[PDB]
Amino acid sequence: TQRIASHSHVKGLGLDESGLAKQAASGLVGQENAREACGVIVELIKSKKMAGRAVLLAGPPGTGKTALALAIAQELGSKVPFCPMVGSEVYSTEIKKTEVLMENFRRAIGLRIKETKEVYEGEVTELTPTISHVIIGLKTAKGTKQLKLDPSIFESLQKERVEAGDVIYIEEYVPLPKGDVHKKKEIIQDVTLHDLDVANARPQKTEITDKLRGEINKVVNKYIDQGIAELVPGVLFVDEVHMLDIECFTYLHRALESSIAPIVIFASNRGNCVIRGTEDITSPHGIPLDLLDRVMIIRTMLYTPQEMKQIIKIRAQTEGINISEEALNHLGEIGTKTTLRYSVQLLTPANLLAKINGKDSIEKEHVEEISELFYDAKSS
Amino acid sequence: QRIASHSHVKGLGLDESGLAKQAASGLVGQENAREACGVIVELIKSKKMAGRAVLLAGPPGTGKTALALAIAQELGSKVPFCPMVGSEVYSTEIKKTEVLMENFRRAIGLRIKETKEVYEGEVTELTPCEISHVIIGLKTAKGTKQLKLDPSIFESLQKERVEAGDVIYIEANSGAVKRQGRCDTYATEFDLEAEEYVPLPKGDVHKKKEIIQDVTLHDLDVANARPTEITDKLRGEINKVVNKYIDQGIAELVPGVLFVDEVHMLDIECFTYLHRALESSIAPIVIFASNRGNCVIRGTEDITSPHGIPLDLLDRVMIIRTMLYTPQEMKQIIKIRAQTEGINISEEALNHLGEIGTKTTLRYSVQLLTPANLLAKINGKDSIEKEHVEEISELFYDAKSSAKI
Amino acid sequence: QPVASPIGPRSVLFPQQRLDQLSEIIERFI
Amino acid sequence: VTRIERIGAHSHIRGLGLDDALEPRQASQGMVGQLAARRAAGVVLEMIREGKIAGRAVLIAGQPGTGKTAIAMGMAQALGPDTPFTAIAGSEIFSLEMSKTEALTQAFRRSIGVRIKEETEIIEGEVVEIQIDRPKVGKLTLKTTEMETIYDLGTKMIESLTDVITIDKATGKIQCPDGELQKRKEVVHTVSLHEIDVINSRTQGFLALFSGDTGEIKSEVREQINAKVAEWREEGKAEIIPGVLFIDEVHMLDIESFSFLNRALESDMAPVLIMATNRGITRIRGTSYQSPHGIPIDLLDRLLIVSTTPYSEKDTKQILRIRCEEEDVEMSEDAYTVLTRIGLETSLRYAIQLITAASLVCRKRKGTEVQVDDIKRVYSLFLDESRSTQYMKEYQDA
Amino acid sequence: TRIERIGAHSHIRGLGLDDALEPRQASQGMVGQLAARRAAGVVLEMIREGKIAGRAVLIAGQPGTGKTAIAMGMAQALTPFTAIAGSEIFSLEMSKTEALTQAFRRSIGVRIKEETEIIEGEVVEIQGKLTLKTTEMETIYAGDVITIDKLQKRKEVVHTVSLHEIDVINSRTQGFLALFSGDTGEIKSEVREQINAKVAEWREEGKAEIIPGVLFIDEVHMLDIESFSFLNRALESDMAPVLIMATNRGITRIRGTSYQSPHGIPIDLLDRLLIVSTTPYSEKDTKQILRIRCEEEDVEMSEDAYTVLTRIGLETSLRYAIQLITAASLVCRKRKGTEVQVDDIKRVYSLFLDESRSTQYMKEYQ
Amino acid sequence: RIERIGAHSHIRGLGLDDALEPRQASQGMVGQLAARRAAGVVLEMIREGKIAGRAVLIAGQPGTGKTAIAMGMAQALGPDTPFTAIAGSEIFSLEMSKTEALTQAFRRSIGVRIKEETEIIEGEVVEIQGKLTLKTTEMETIYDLGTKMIESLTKDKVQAGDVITIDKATGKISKLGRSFTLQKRKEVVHTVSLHEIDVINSRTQGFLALFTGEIKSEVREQINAKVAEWREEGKAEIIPGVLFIDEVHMLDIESFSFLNRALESDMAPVLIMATNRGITRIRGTSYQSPHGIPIDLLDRLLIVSTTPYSEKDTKQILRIRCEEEDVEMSEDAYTVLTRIGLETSLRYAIQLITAASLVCRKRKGTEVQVDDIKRVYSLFLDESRSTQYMKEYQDA
Amino acid sequence: CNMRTQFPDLRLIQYDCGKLQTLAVLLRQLKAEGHRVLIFTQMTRMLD
Secondary structure (H helix, E strand, C coil): CCCCCCCCCCCCCCCCCCCCCCCCCCCCCCCHHHHHHHHHHHHHHHHCCCCCCEEEEECCCCCCHHHHHHHHHHCCCCCCCEEECCHHHHCCCCCCHHHHHHHHHHHHCEEEEEEEEEEECCEEEECCCCCCCEEEEEEECCEEEEEEECHHHHHHHHHCCCCCCCECCECCCCCCCCCCCCEEEEEEEEEEHHHHHHHHHCCCCCCCHHHHHHHHHHHHHHHHCCCCEEEECCEEEEECCCCCEHHHHHHHHHHCCCCCCCEEEEECCCCCCCCECCCCCCCHHHCCHHHHCCEEEEECCCCCHHHHHHHHHHHHHHHCCCCCHHHHHHHHHHHHHCCHHHHHHCCHHHHHHHHHHCCCCCCHHHHHHHHHHCCCCCCC | CCCCCCCCCCCCCECCCCCECCCCCCCCCCHHHHHHHHHHHHHHHHCCCCCCEEEEECCCCCCHHHHHHHHHHHHCCCCCEEEEEHHHCCCCCCCHHHHHHHHHHHHCEEECCECCCCCCCCCCCCECCCCCCEEEEEEECCEEEEEEECHHHHHHHHHCCCCCCCCEEECCCCCEEECCCCCCCCCCCCCCCCCCCCCCCCCCCCCCCCECCEEEHHHHHHHHHCCCECCCCHHHHHHHHHHHHHHHCCCEEECCEEEEECCCCCEHHHHHHHHHHCCCCCCCEEEEECCCCCEECECCCCCEEHHHCCHHHHCCCEEEECCCCCHHHHHHHHHHHHHHHCCCCCCHHHHHHHHHHHHCCHHHHHHHHHHHHHHHHHHCCCCCCHHHHHHHHHHCECHHHHHHC | CCCCCCCCCCCCCCCCCCCCCCCCCCCCCC | CCCCCCCCCCCCCCCCCCCCCCCCCCCECCECCCHHHHHHHHHHHHHHHHCCCCCCEEEEEECCCCCHHHHHHHHHHCCCCCCCEEEEECCCCCCCCCCHHHHHHHHHHHHCEEEECCEEEEECCEECCCCCCCCCCCCEEEECCCCCEEECCCCHHHCCCCCECCECCCCCCCCCCCCCCCEEEECCEEECCCHHHHHHCCCHHHHHCCCCCCCCCCCCCCCHHHHHHHHCCCCCCCEEECCEEEEECCCCCEHHHHHHHHHHCCCCCCCCEEEEECCCCCCCECCCCCCHHHCCHHHHCCEEEEEECCCCHHHHHHHHHHHHHHCCCEECHHHHHHHHHHHHHCCHHHHHHHHHHHHHHHHHHCCCEECHHHHHHHHHHCCCCCCCCHHHCCCCCC | CCCCCCCCCCCCCCCCCCCCCCCCCCCCCCCCCHHHHHHHHHHHHHHHHCCCCCCEEEEECCCCCCHHHHHHHHHHCCCCEEEECCCCCCCCCCCCCHHHHHHHHCCCEEEEEEEEEEEEEECCCCCCCCCCCCCCCCCCCCCCEEEEECCEEEEEEEEEECCCHHHHHHCCCCCCCCCECCCCCCCHHHHHHHHHHHHHHHHHHCCEEEECCEEEEECCCCCCHHHHHHHHHHCCCCCCCEEEEECCCCECCCCCCCCCCECCCCCCCHHHCEEEECCCCCHHHHHHHHHHHCCCCCCCCCCCHHHHHHHHHHHCCHHHHHHHHHHHHHHHHHHCCCCCCHHHHHHHHHHCECHHHHCCCCCCCC | CCCCCCCCCCCCCCCCCCCCCCCCCECCECCCHHHHHHHHHHHHHHHHCCCCCCEEEEECCCCCCCCHHHHHHHHCCCCCCCEEEEECCCCCCCCCCHHHHHHHHHHHCEEEEEEEEECCCCCEEEEECCEEEEECCCCEEEECCCCHHHHHHHHCCCCCCCCCCCCCCCCCCCCCCCCCCCCCCEEEEEEEECCCHHHHHCCCCCCCCCCCCCCCCCHHHHHHHHHHHHHHCCCECCEECEEEEECHHHCCHHHHHHHHHHCCCCCCCEEEEECCCCEEECECECCEEECCCCHHHHHHCEEEECCCCCHHHHHHHHHHHHHHCCCCCCCCCHHHHHHHHHHCCHHHHHHHHHHHHHHHHHHCCCCCCHHHHHHHHHHCCCHHHHHHCCCCCCCC | CCCCCCCCCCCHHHHHCHHHHHHHHHHHHHCCCCCCCCCCCCCHHHHC
């Protein structure tokens, strides 16, 4: 199941060798300055240079910030974790706001852990019935091998029950444990700090900052310098940053000045507004003066009418149907009348009604009749 | 008999032709509203219409609560009647939507008369000689019998004290309630056994008892949820098992009738759940009552609407008008209290009390009827005279004279 | 006797490298 | 020497003075003054003690400081034993754990009482180190100063034995007058409608003595309990007694409690409750609409307002004389005149606060009579509400 | 006398369209609303196909067009349907984010094909050796019933389970939380990552499949801005069921803020709603739907009464005229007649009144 | 050990001399004479161990370094001394109250040093199936075991030859025992934090001392009484700690009135308040007040204002940022960078340096081109440019 | 099993008496030589 969403045509950023511009770069078209401003910071993401930075996105509704917010994470792959979180999930009744924010910061910052282990399996023969010598046979499909082991291991086997000719994990059921005499394996995976904080809370939830800071950072410091753990942070994305309480703004532009803080990309859509919790404030982009001195403001341009064909062509490629000249002309006209989201919205039911009526292509009269069927939000 | 505030209600007085009498069961007035509530009680008793709403539009101080009580007394004990105060919705731990939905489930009820045989226990038949087979006798005042019981009941027996002289109530679903110390246990005229001393349980072994029982669905939901209901798994299962019980021929569904006071004092989210949940096909009939007139809906701060009801809620609701009265029957209504009181009054004191009732309001005279009889009992008069009522009209003041001073 | 959904419902990096990171084992060191 | 119940503000009275013809006196049972309020209190007390009607509200109001709470205190003192009196305030139902409607119907549950007549058997006697052990009844001999009894024990009574030991009909419990041990007893017991909590949840004592329970289970506590207390009614068994509820500070209560009181008095099990009101025109909470009395018309039509008159010069000196009779330290006649002038110009509670300090200055003097200069120095050192108003012209903070 | 017999506007079975998706003038469903029922059929065909996600359809019009009847027709013609109100997600134990999330994730269904091996029956041994009280077989290798899972039968079971596996993984037992709502805000990583990985493994192994659902949210004229900020990500998520919003009021100030916007929505949800407007009923359409609703409770009317009923229902509300035949059928039953008259419906109109009658007579203000 | 250097981790301590004179090129802190002078006064007052509980506020223009001076005081505070930085927004909780969180903040920053004595014997262990033989540098002695020592050796997988420590309470220590495959007094002075009030109140200690209204009534009183008893019988002293309150103007007046009377107690540590703006009304009331603070709390505290930065101090801070982040700059870029940093904030200039270093290392060059940092500055905007370039009326 | 009492270990009376401090210093210095130490008492309470 592919489950094609709205922003499913976006593959990556599409920077060639220097990172300036391309038109058909396997995704969203246009927006040269935004692509440069998001292609500068991925070297800081992959290089682990600074911490506690902020990225501010601004523009009208319809610039496609979700497409670039996906493309900045798909270029990183599965190496860097990406966990988006809007301000609606920060709002809660039982659990407080700053606890959910700290769990988001622990979902951002991650670890890489390697481990080498030796695994023994196969059926066993014993002869021992404790003076420094334990005979252990090991039979597998590759053959037989005899080993000398310590009497403490034989005492630990004597603690439980040992069947004559069973499968014992030395570190009717279980038929044929296929494998050689020893398995020496080195596996590297990733660790999220949210699961570690849950396991510290519930081994089998408001927290005090002592276990949060020191009891994690001391064992991280003791495990990096040995050569096991590697600290890899993540990139957060907060959509609708202007719809937040001012206490959340104080917490954000305090926590961005900390020594341990990942990079967070803000998304501010609306212009001047009243900040919730306070009155008589007409600050730009719903953001006070303190946070504006910390964020990186990125201005997004407006899409040209020539690039609407480049938007609709990759969507027709994703759907899998061709568009005629008059149909593309009418779609371009209704994409110049209103926003392009209305042009993307009328791609699926036109194809479905053409499949019902028996039309392999898209007719200008067909999209005219389905525009007569329902009208846009502008003329409501 | 401990007569309450209003006990005039014993009926509504509807004939077969569909006319309204002038004086029936102490409910003088509003023959148009009498026919308008006769139509809705016929709609309730017809058992075919569910999902309706009744509003009683009138000034404050007309007595529409007595009309709803007359509806409930004409229905009687067959149809469940559960009135709800508007201040019963604003809970702290349970959300208001769930409170309104649980009231809607309190409305709907069933009746599935059944049976149940009693066993009552012998004295001593502890015979575990097989565990699958237990022999237990019975020694009642009518005589002695025996019965063989499967091992369980016995597993409930060893949990409780089964000694010489006990009671063993056994239900049909292995529900055992047991006592200790019965019949006789006075062996050597010794001290306390510290038990319950009961005489002989007179009665035979095998009765066949039949009880008609009304069961509400909310008690069923409480008994099934425990060892906020899911509207995809729990109430659908209840609907399916009630459908199976009424298709097999066990239970009989009755319609639900509710009566809500101070409707306009509720939140607008309660309104947008109310006129969405009464649009269901299983919704009971709810008689709404609006107390005051044009005010602000709670949660809007600017929207002006009549009777404190929004335009989406004011539609699809029947409206029954209840206007004011004429003063020349007020002395009749006081007389309706007099036959309720049991002490006869005079003729001129009725005139003075009717003058006080038509001065400001009838309820002031109704409340002053009690200290008039109290001072008549204290001073020793067999009836209420004019001096006691003209003294109690000046001793006790209403809200108008309190706002004047 | 009905039942709606259940008959019976259905409901390797670990290896001794993360138990030492946790202090929530029976030993409460203080 | 030192007790819990000390001399407070409204504890100086010892009841309410009433007669058979309902004629008030000038000084009866501590309460002095308020003749129309005395007659209204006598009428409502006789109406409650009659116990015929149910669900009536009688409001009292007036100027703050006219001794309006002391009238209800004298009604509660002269109410009589074995009668539940519940005195609540307008702020008790405000809670963040339970609802205000649940708290108000809990107060309604506390109001109505049940008198239950039972007959038990209580065995008393001294135990003389008996019951030779298991190989397990043994014997039991009790001694009195008239006649001793010698007999055996029971089976299940060996757990309580592992000094007069009083054992009832049940399992058991913990100079002495004589008599037969099979003493039979009648126990007229008063229940404040605690029949709900004993079956509403398990461990009924920890929910009955201190709170912690949620809202009580709907469709189980209002119809079933009422039907069963009707089953215990009119069969020779116990009969309910409507108690007296007294509510404070109604004029600053929410409109939802007003709407609940509009329909709670019309029910069957509705006790006769009285309430107090201090302020006049005050805007109700919840809305921004102004209204007289602090109570809307929909509830004022369901109650009766009894207004109270302020005191005079003759009643104030009688209150001062009866409070000097309640206290120990006496005063001089010129000091009584000065204190009467202070109680006429200022409030009565201000004179109550001055007379205790004057008695303490007299105790510093180690005498039995308060002079004029002592109470003059107390009045000079201690300020008043109307006195300290003119000293606020410095504009210290706003 | 079973539980649902008649209610509000739901009497028609299914929805009524054709092969060319054109509604008739006398068929199943309602009379009129060609463009509205056509767009409803198009979006219902989109639900039946299930190609993309994030399809939010807004319906609007004058009060009295019957959006609930269209929703019930699309529900019966439809797969898990769910119709919620605007106050069900507003709870106290849960937040305004978790409850709307649980309302979103409940419409998603999962079909599970499970093949098990069961050896059941009655005992005839004890102490180890297994046989039966059989009809068929023997050969060991009293009275109680024992079932052993690996006579012998390979049973195939089809399960239709919602996403409440998230309810049972976080829980300890399956008995408590499966009967009510549940706990507070849980681990959202456990909701997203492990569930998506295990359902993806079930898709790769071919054991279970998933189907989307439909959520009908009525009366969206009042809604706090927290849900409007949540729908920015909810419509732009990886997976989401289809949403049908119903808004009655045109211009309404949003609670908590102070703005003037159509349909009570911001600019972010403005371009995300397929908006369908309606048309009020004419004379013939109202008369025809009254002719349809006369066949509900088997009530016959006279010839001169339909014109009077339509004349009342045109000036006043339509639902009042729907209630008039029910309020007049009881008077006709008490009259002992098989046909209503003009005086009957005039008497019922004199008894019960509407807002336009009570507007003038409330000039007392006492 | 891999932790990225933040915006406030670029300095190491505070500039301090024998006469306590502020310097310019000392430990990365440049300028700000009077505020660092008062910071050195209160830092010597803290480190002396004399008094604690004076409320000091730091005010000034936005961007003068009101936060970095607190980090410079905390780094130069010294080891084994608690430092806690809490904002106003952290104590806005729906599970607990504001005053309880403020008492947690007050009782968290009071450290207690407790001395203990044990014995630790280190040597080679030879086990005889049993008894042990310790081969040490001093002596080679054979010990006879009792009952609990053999049990403690058999509950663990004890390997012979490793270091086994025998304490007074018989607690084993297994440190570096699997790396290949009389000693009278060790006085240990351990530092604890006073978060054990609910340990007095409640019963659990594992889940409680890590991550809860805790019987205020007479819980703190018994703890303070036993602290006073320990203070005598010189078994336990007490050191204070620094509590930084960040952006106190976003706090209700109820917490202000609670802090007005919670500071007068003997258990009140030193607290450094932060206030950014000037005339700001109090959240909760209707009257305005200076610094977002009423007259009652203003009488309690003292105010230190920050001097705005100069040109040469800004150039020296940019030189420190040049020498810290390993970014080689050109000599012709300092004037352009100072011209950018004069009209904008300093942290925007730090972000400009970082982005220019990113583009220069993408170019893989050593020197920073003036045209390169000009292109990077032209790529992004300012806050006044975010005010200016949004004149298209995109929304309402 | 925190016996909810936490019995006091007898160490403080040494902090309550400088004579006990000097006696503890003399005893811990005389045990380093490896010789015997005599203790002389007068009453049974001093023995306890």
